[PDB]
């Protein structure tokens, strides 16, 4: 019953290959619902979830004016930050930003976030007080002085505590059939000999929403953390996610191993074994 909204901005320079591309995508939890790409043939905010389509032309207009304004603003920030690092005009660089609001199970604001990165390193972040900044280095201290002068933290606190939360709550209602619905994993255990002495047990979770899950192997009731091969949670392309966890076990000590599954969508946490 906990929910969040995030917007992800990526601005990428490309000297010799035109002006920097600006992309913005908006999510509620693991569901994308809008995009804007300054490289699209006709750059506009586009819906990416059915429940956002009902929004009126006023809403799509508003979105598009912010993202075009940001397209320009980020092109200057890229110019600025290249200077802050005394960088050559030859190189391609990236600014990323992620911000939004986290709601608790009650629907109250748990916390706000606003972070920025430059070339994949933390650059500046609004602190949890929503009033002050943490700058990673002396270049970001320049950005900080500018953001203090324009009272940016004040403005972001107002949005994060206000509009961000109201809209997320609007979206959760309009998309309630999917956004407020958790789909439990479908699970099984596969067994493959890798030798005459040992065999791999792979525990599968499929079809789950949202992405957050915990998959653990235990031997005689204790975690095999270093011995577990854990693959990254991957999207199916139908809104759901997949994961597995494998262990290599002495043959046949297979019964001493249990796969443990936790997911928000489950009746109870699950315990599985290989069923020959």
């Amino acid at each position: 019953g906990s929910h969040s909204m995030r917007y992800f901005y990526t601005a990428m320079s490309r000297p010799g290959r035109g002006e920097p591309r600006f992309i913005a995508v908006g999510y509620v939890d693991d569901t994308q619902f809008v995009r804007f790409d300054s490289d699209a043939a006709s750059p506009r905010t586009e819906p990416r979830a059915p429940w956002i389509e009902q929004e009126g032309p006023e809403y799509w207009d508003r979105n598009t004016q912010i993202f075009k304004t940001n397209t320009q603003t980020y092109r200057e920030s890229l110019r600025n930050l290249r200077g802050y690092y005394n960088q050559s005009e030859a190189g391609s660089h990236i600014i990323q930003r992620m911000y939004g609001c986290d709601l608790g199970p009650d629907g109250r604001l748990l916390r706000g976030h606003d972070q920025s990165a430059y070339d994949g390193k933390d650059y500046i972040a609004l602190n949890e007080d929503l009033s002050s900044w943490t700058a990673a280095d002396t270049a970001a201290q320049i950005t900080q002085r500018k953001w203090e002068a324009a009272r940016v933290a004040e403005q972001l606190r107002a949005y994060l505590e206000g509009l961000c939360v109201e809209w997320l709550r609007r979206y959760l209602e309009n998309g309630k059939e999917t956004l407020q619905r958790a789909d439990p994993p479908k699970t099984h255990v596969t067994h493959h000999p890798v030798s005459d002495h040992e065999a791999t047990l792979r525990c599968w979770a499929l079809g789950f929403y949202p992405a957050e899950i915990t998959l653990t192997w235990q031997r005689d009731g204790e975690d095999q953390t270093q011995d577990t091969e854990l693959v990254e949670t991957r999207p199916a392309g139908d809104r759901t996610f997949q994961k597995w966890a494998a262990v290599v076990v002495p043959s046949g000590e297979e019964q001493r191993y249990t796969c443990h599954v936790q997911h928000e969508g489950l009746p109870k946490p699950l315990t599985l074994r290989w069923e020959p």
């Binding site: 913005a24 940001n70 920030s77 600014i95 500018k146 953001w147 509009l163 809209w167």
Partner: peptide, 9 residues
């Protein structure tokens, strides 16, 4: 809804 203010870095 996205944050409405663009600010230069």
């Amino acid at each position: 809804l996205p944050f409405e203010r663009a600010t230069v870095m």
